[PDB]
């Protein structure tokens, strides 16, 4: 075990402006899929000072109360009393969504069996896994997610009632190399900025942050006397969320995925239905990456897949195992070709992607949570 | 070892890139009058409507309508998108050396000695394909071309002790918007001869290369910060989440990422390595970086731990020093908003620092 190195990931809570827009975008997606499971949705949410704008394209036989969808999401996030900084009742909802609803045609809509239909766009997608945690994800991002989930739970239970939904966490971890695999040694640095009420002091918060959040989240084996704790380091932070800075769907794509580990091909997931390869292939690529680690073929893998618009079969598939694989990456390509079919139409069938389960992906990461079908690994015939 | 790798790129007329260009055009307009103007301008576009949203703090007075419409005109949209009939909703809120970072975040710098500009060939070719089509459109040599294009280049590599060397072109994809008065076969032939042959070196091309040209068979919502991989390295290296366009130099998502590239390119150009990934991270209100990490893919002679000492002695990566070194108060950001932020020697972060090692 030769070289020590540091690595940092960040994460944000449900009340961060960008993540509000991700959650609303997928809440809109779920609303359509509950009524029309083949609804084509591309819904970009922007938010600023008690205003929400929905923008993009929809083609659905559903009828959605966008005002209610938006306002429920914001209420659920925690901006339900104005005492928490904002009101979900006073929120402006401008809907600028180009809408169609399928017109009964003499021609059939799909001329193909849906599994053989060509990819809706081009693009690059990445799947990554690492056997350092049980959920096959980097500890840096998993801890950054769990810190936000911890604060959310303590907020909703009233145990720290001064908490407001807008939070941001960053965890730097100290690693050791092990023939291309990576093993967590200690916690280098932790940062937590979080929105608060007026009736609490910085010292109360910082102490409450260390004891009731960090100690509950991070295993004590990883925590040290030399760990740095930058807690509420910006100073005061009362006004945030919708009332704060401008939020947009697709500005937290690294937080959504792997926190710097592996790679990314550009695609924002939230707002987009399952016929968009930016989402479906990326979910499938994770599925492949996690399956290869869970089978014991490797300890750490980065998978790339690419498409062309109108072509069903992937253009290229690449495997990078950081030398932790026993077999060659070329050999492992054969294993993936024989155990998986990565055409978009087969990807939806395998992963059950017509279900309205997307709002839950819009915070705390799209990967690492076994509740989603792409996190349950496939047993491989190798 | 052999392996494949794919990068994509989009043209000036792609909805997302329109919004990136407008966002930085707005940034430049402010910096021409107030060089310390704080700008965070998110542009959304759909069907002849443009919405600007976010925060500004500037003593400049900007004709946002003119800034937006000139940008769209310059991209190539004269008539149906149209710059003359274009709605401009402006919803931008106004407020009011060892300074702390304006936010937290992760940033990555990456370089590779496969091309002269120290970038992956996959992304560089994908960029040049779009730049080629733009030039042929504006000169009238292919007047059927319209500004919205998308290119994807898959390249076949060979490993060389952690460095990567391009062997051949596996696949090329080009989708591009067009006029009604031209046939698919004319376009596809014109795509291969006048674009691809002019862009890609013939040594890399062979008769077993796949050409998916206009494969969709002859406008959607655009947003700033939806082309961040196209903006950077095309899948190679890594990304920390930050969208560059619309944000001024006091935002670390942009300034640190530009500085991290500068470090990454300097280490390759000095001959300390052939390929490197650098990570830097910050905390809000702290000037000095929290962590700095070096990953050389085993192409480095020195240890990555040793190379950390080289970077510590040759660079100061506090945001306030980063702006001074890289001259980031200049209005040069609209040019970064298409064709990649990295690989172009015209920008100060692409000129490498000679290292005392």
**What does B297-323 look like in DSSP terms, one character per residue?**
TT--SS-HHHHHHHHHHH---SHHHHH
Q: Which residue of B has its CA nearest to A2?
A: B303
Q: Which residues are CB-neighbours of A227 under 8 A, at least 6 positions away?
A: A186, A187, A188, A189, A190
Q: How far apart are the first and last CA of chain A?
A: 29
Q: How far is CA B52 from CA A165, A268, B61, B344, in A?
A: 26, 20, 15, 28
Chain A's closest residue to B174, CA to CA, is A308
Residues of B in contact with A172 (CB under 8 A): 281, 290-291
* In contact, A261 and A141? CB cutoff 8 Å: yes
Question: Which segments within B138-271 are labelled E, that is strand?
Answer: 145-160, 163-178, 210-213, 222-223
Which two three-digit tokens encode residue A82? Answer: 């104005």
Q: Going edge to edge, which strands form the sheet with A247-248?
A: A92-99, A51-59, A40-48, A247-248
Burial of residue B11 (CB within 10 Å: 0-12, 13-18, 19+) is buried
| A-proximal residues of B, 145-184, CB under 8 Å | 150, 152, 154, 170-171, 173, 175
| Contact state of A96 with B46 under an 8 Å Cβ cutoff | yes
A window 334-363, beta carbon within 8 A of B = none
Of B309, B227, B288, the C-alpha closest to B14 is B227
8 Å CB contact between A234 and A195? no
What is the arrangement of strands in the sheet containing B87-94, beginning at the earlier edge strand?
A: B87-94, B49-57, B38-46, B222-223
How many Cβ atoms from other residues are within 10 Å of residue B155's Cβ? 27
Length of chain B: 357
Residues 6+ apart with CB under 8 A from B221: A42, A44, A55, A56, A57, B15, B44, B45, B46
CB atoms within 10 A of CB A340: 19
Q: Which residue of B has its CA nearest to A268?
A: B226
d(CA B157, CA B121) in angstroms, rounded, equals 10
Contact A216, A178 (CB under 8 A): no
Give CA–CA dist B233/A163, Å, rounded: 39
Largest pairwise CA distance in chain B = 63
Q: How many CB atoms lie within 10 A of CB A374?
A: 26
The answer to whether the CB of B69 falls within 8 A of the CB of B37 is: no
For residue A112, how far is the Cα from the chain centroid? 32
User: What is the spatial distance between Cα A310 and Cα B75, in angstroms, rounded to a whole number?
Assistant: 27
Number of Cα atoms under 13 Å in the Cβ half of residue B321: 9
Q: Could you give the angle at the alpha carbon of B343 between the alpha carbons of B235 and B222, nearest 5°?
A: 60
Query: Taking a contact as any Cβ pair under 8 Å apart, which residues of chain A between 237 and 296 contact chain B?
Result: 245-246, 248-255, 259-266, 268
CA atoms of A248 and B201, how far apart (whole Å): 40
**A10–B contact, CB cutoff 8 A:** yes
Q: Which two tokens stand for residue B98?
A: 């060892």
Give the three-state DSSP class for B350. helix
Backbone angles phi, psi at B252, to 5 degrees: -65, -30
Contacts of A279 in chain B (CB under 8 A): none
* Chain B residues within 8 A of A233 when measuring between CB atoms: 283-286
Q: Which of B304, B302, B301 is nearest to B292 (CA)?
A: B304
What H or E segment, with its residue span, contains residue B88? Answer: strand B87-94
Structure tokens at B335: 């040019």
> Under a CB-based contact definition with an 8 Å cutoff, are residues A278 and A266 in contact?
yes
Helices B319-326 + B252-269 axis angle, to 10: 60
Q: Are B146 and B180 in contact (CB under 8 A)?
A: no
Alpha carbon of A306: minimum distance to chain B alpha carbons (Å): 7
A chain contacts of residue B236, beta-carbon cutoff 8 Å: 263
| Residue A3 backbone phi and psi in degrees, to 5 | -105, 130
Backbone angles phi, psi at A278, to 5 degrees: -50, -35
Does residue A37 sit at the B interface (CB-CB below 8 Å)? no
Q: Which of residues 205-234 of B touch A (CB under 8 A)?
A: 210, 212, 215-217, 220-221, 223-230, 234
| B221: nearest CB among A56, A264, A304 | A56
Kindly report the nearest CA distance between residue B32 and chain A, in angstroms: 24
Among all chains, which residue has been given the structure tokens 């998993």? A142
Cα–Cα distances (Å) from A55 to A118, A280, B52, B171, B318, in that order, read 26, 21, 13, 34, 38
Distance of alpha carbon A133 from alpha carbon A137, whole angstroms: 6
| Chain B: closest CA distance from residue A350 (Å) | 25
Q: Which of A85, A88, A91, A94 is nearest to A244 (CA)?
A: A85
Q: Tally Cβ neighbours within 10 Å of residue A32.
A: 24
Confirm if A292 and A336 have CB atoms less than 8 A apart.
Answer: yes
SS3 per residue for chain A: CCCEEEEEEEEECCCCHHHHHHHHHHHHHHHHHCCCCCCEEEEEEEEECCEEEEEEEEECCCCCCHHHHHHHHHHHHCCCCHHHCCCCCCCEEEEEEEECCCCCCCCCCCCCCCCCCCCCCCEEEEEEEECCCCCCCCHHHHHHHHHHHHHHHHHHCCCCCCEEEEEEEEEEEEEEEECCEEEEEEEEEEEEEEEECCCCCHHHHHHHHHHHHHHHHCCHHHCCCCCEEEECCCCCCCCCHHHCCCEECCCCHHHHCCCCCCCCCCCCCCCECCCCHHHHHHHHHHHHHHHHHHCCCCCEEEEEEEECCCCCCCCEEEEECCCCCCCCHHHHHHHHHHHCCCCHHHHHHHHCCCCCCCHHHHCCCCCCCCCCHHHCCCCCCC
Residue A198 CA from chain centroid, whole number: 31
Find out whether B253 and B247 touch, Cβ atoms under 8 Å.
yes
Measured CA to CA, the distance from residue B239 to residue B242 in angstroms comes to 8
**Hey, CA dihedral for B102, B316, A188, A365, is it positive or negative?**
positive
Handedness of CA B176, B179, B184, B185 (dihedral sign): negative
Furthest CA-CA distance within chain A = 73
Do B219 and B15 touch, CB atoms closer than 8 A?
Answer: yes
Contacts of A230 (CB under 8 A, 6+ apart): A189, A190, A191, A192, B283, B286, B290
Nearest to B39 by CA among B103, B90, B92: B92
Other Cβ atoms closer than 10 A to B306: 13
**Interstrand relation of A92-99 and A51-59 (parallel, antiparallel or unpaired):** parallel
Pairwise CB contact (< 8 Å): B215 & A310: yes
Strands B105-112, A316-320: pairing kind: unpaired
What is the C-alpha separation between B262 and B181, in angstroms, rounded? 46
Three-class DSSP category at B148? strand
Q: Tell me whether residues B54 and A245 touch, CB distance under 8 A.
A: yes
CA-closest candidate to residue A273, choices A348, A333, A329: A348
Nearest CA distance, A305 vs chain B (angstrom): 8
Helix (H) / strand (E) containing B18? helix B15-31
**Neighbour-count burial for A315-326, b at 16+ CB within 10 Å, e otherwise:** bbbbbbbbebbe
CB contact under 8 A, A309 and B44: no
CB contact residues (below 8 A), chain A span 124-143, against chain B = 124, 126
The rounded distance, in Å, linking the Cα atoms of B73 and B138 is 12
The whole-angstrom separation of Cα B82 and Cα A360 is 39
Question: Between A and B, how many residue pairs show a Cβ–Cβ distance under 8 A?
Answer: 203
């Amino acid at each position: 075990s030769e070289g020590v190195f540091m690595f940092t990931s960040e994460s944000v809570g449900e009340g961060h402006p960008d993540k509000i827009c991700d959650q609303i975008s997928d809440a809109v997606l779920d609303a359509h899929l509950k009524q029309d499971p083949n609804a084509k949705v591309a819904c970009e949410t922007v938010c600023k000072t008690g205003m929400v704008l929905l923008c993009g394209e929809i083609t659905s036989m559903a009828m959605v109360d966008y005002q209610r969808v938006v306002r429920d999401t914001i209420k659920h996030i925690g901006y339900d009393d104005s005492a928490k900084g904002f009101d979900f009742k006073t929120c402006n909802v401008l809907v600028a969504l180009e809408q169609q609803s399928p017109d009964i045609a003499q021609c059939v809509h799909l001329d193909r069996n849906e599994e053989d239909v060509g990819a809706g766009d081009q693009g690059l997608m990445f799947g990554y896994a690492t056997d350092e945690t049980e959920e096959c994800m980097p500890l840096t991002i998993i801890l950054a997610h769990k810190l936000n989930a911890r604060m959310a739970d303590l907020r909703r239970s009233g145990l720290l009632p001064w908490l407001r939904p807008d939070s941001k966490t960053q965890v730097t971890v100290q690693y050791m190399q092990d023939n291309g695999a990576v093993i967590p040694v200690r916690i280098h640095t932790i940062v937590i900025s979080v929105q608060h009420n007026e009736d609490i002091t910085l010292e109360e918060m910082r102490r409450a942050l260390k004891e009731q959040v960090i100690r509950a989240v991070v295993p004590a084996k990883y925590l040290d006397e030399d760990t740095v704790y930058h807690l509420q380091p910006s100073g005061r932070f009362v006004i945030g969320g919708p009332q704060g800075d401008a939020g947009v769907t697709g500005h937290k794509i690294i937080v959504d995925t792997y926190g710097g580990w592996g790679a990314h091909g550009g695609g924002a997931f939230s707002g987009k239905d399952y016929t968009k390869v930016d989402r479906s292939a990326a979910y499938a690529a994770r599925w492949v990456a996690k399956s290869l680690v869970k089978a014991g073929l490797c300890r750490r893998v980065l998978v790339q897949v690419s498409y062309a618009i109108g072509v069903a079969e992937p253009l290229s598939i690449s495997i990078f195992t950081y030398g932790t694989s026993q077999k060659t990456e070329r050999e492992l390509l054969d294993v993936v070709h024989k155990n998986f079919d990565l055409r978009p139409g087969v990807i939806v069938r395998d992963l059950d992607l017509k279900k309205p389960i997307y709002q839950k992906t819009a915070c705390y990461g799209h990967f690492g949570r076994s509740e989603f079908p792409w996190e349950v690994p496939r047993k491989l015939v190798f």
